[PDB]
């Protein structure tokens, strides 16, 4: 699982 | 920007 809010 | 990989 990978989540990124950049 | 938003990246999501379940």
Author numbering:
A (entry chain B), B (entry chain A): 1 to 6
The article reads:
We determine nine polymorphic crystal structures of the APR segments of glucagon-like peptides 1 and 2, and exendin and its derivatives. We propose that the pH-dependent changes of the protonation states of glutamate/aspartate residues of APRs initiate switching between the amyloid and the folded, monomeric forms of the hormones.
Four polymorphic crystal forms were grown from solutions of APRTc5b. As the concentration of EtOH was reduced from 30% to 10% in the crystallization solution (keeping all the other parameters identical), the entire cross-β scaffold rearranged from parallel to antiparallel relative orientation. On the other hand, nearly identical polymorphic structures were obtained from the crystals grown in 10% EtOH and 30% ACN (polymorph A vs. C). In polymorphs A and C of APRTc5b, an acetonitrile/ethanol solvent molecule is incorporated in the aromatic cluster, leading to somewhat larger ring-to-ring distances as compared to those of APRex-4. In the presence of organic solvents, the exendin-like structures adopted more compact crystal forms, in which opposing side chains of the steric zippers interact with each other.
